[PDB]
Symmetry: C2
Subunit: 195 residues, 2 copies
């Protein structure tokens, strides 16, 4: 077991894939740095999910895994898993395949405004969410939203300003408060697979 702080990486693209990991607590994003400098979120790893999947098939990781919150991960030796462990891995990888394909569709469904609303609602069901008197909120940056909505930070910031002005969200202390869930749901249209 090993703990990681927000923004620390669990593994990097191109490095030896000797270890398979299972996320115990927190939220991890698998990302790719594009030719033009853009960082793109490929998928979200949630508690219970196996990642560093390359350890099961290749020699090196193909992507980089970054903790989005304080995260607790368990390293595992692929070659030392029993029948029961393999069953859990197969079932969980199947669930992540369902989720990443849904995420893929989301990136191509609706204008930016709808994609942002959908992503915020998705995050509301992850370890990135919390609640207080002001309401439900998610701790995420404008850049991270851009990374998961096929857009750039400047465009995300503009839509967030619109949503603030309209009363759907509020921002404070690196958080995005979801003030009108019903309105956000309508903006997103279809929800994004949270489990």
């Amino acid at each position: 077991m090993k703990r990681f702080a927000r923004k620390e990486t669990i593994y990097l693209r191109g490095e030896e894939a000797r270890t398979l990991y299972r996320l115990e607590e927190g939220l991890v994003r698998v990302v790719e740095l594009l030719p033009d400098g853009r960082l793109i979120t490929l998928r979200h790893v949630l508690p219970g999910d196996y990642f560093g999947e390359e350890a099961l098939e290749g020699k090196a990781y193909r992507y980089t895994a970054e903790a989005m919150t304080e995260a607790v991960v368990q390293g595992l030796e692929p070659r030392a898993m029993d029948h029961e462990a393999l069953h859990r891995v197969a079932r969980n990888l199947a669930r992540q395949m369902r989720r990443v394909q849904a995420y893929e569709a989301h990136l191509q469904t609706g204008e930016l405004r709808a994609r942002i609303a959908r992503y915020l609602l998705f995050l509301a069901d992850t370890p990135l969410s919390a609640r207080d008197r002001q309401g439900i909120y998610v701790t995420v940056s404008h850049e991270e939203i851009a990374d998961a909505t096929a857009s750039i930070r400047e465009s995300v910031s503009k839509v967030l300003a619109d949503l603030r002005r309209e009363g759907l969200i509020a921002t404070a202390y690196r958080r995005v408060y979801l003030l009108d869930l019903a309105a956000l749901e309508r903006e997103a249209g279809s929800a994004l697979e949270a489990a």
Copy 2:
């Protein structure tokens, strides 16, 4: 074992996921029909790949699987797999996860022209490819290219017309001949994971 003809579906979104499948021959695409009528290719299933993955985790398929060529598939009972089978499934799902994330990145890397060149080169390494005197070719429609390049058919057709005029490709009998591989590689920039 069961054989499917091009365009026939192996399973449909929302139907009971009682069966896990392994593609023996041919090429299958997993797709989603979007709200606005758009069909989107979520991933490519190649010989050896397990699909209908929902049978390992849920009660119903979440997407639709369509044969892109004559395809031979083997149905499997998830609950009847031994240690060796589970190992193969885990390893293969890990490989498909690597490939679908690379596909995801491709959809957001470069202008349409580069995305089309990249997709054509990817297909050149699948069962959709063949060769004759005119050269290497891939049997694919303009619509299928649009479905896998985050674009619409009209836009794909225009770029293909440009590529024909420039000599990079030629078209005939529902095929796209790749005449200048070097030029296409340069257009694509980065290659798309073929295995």
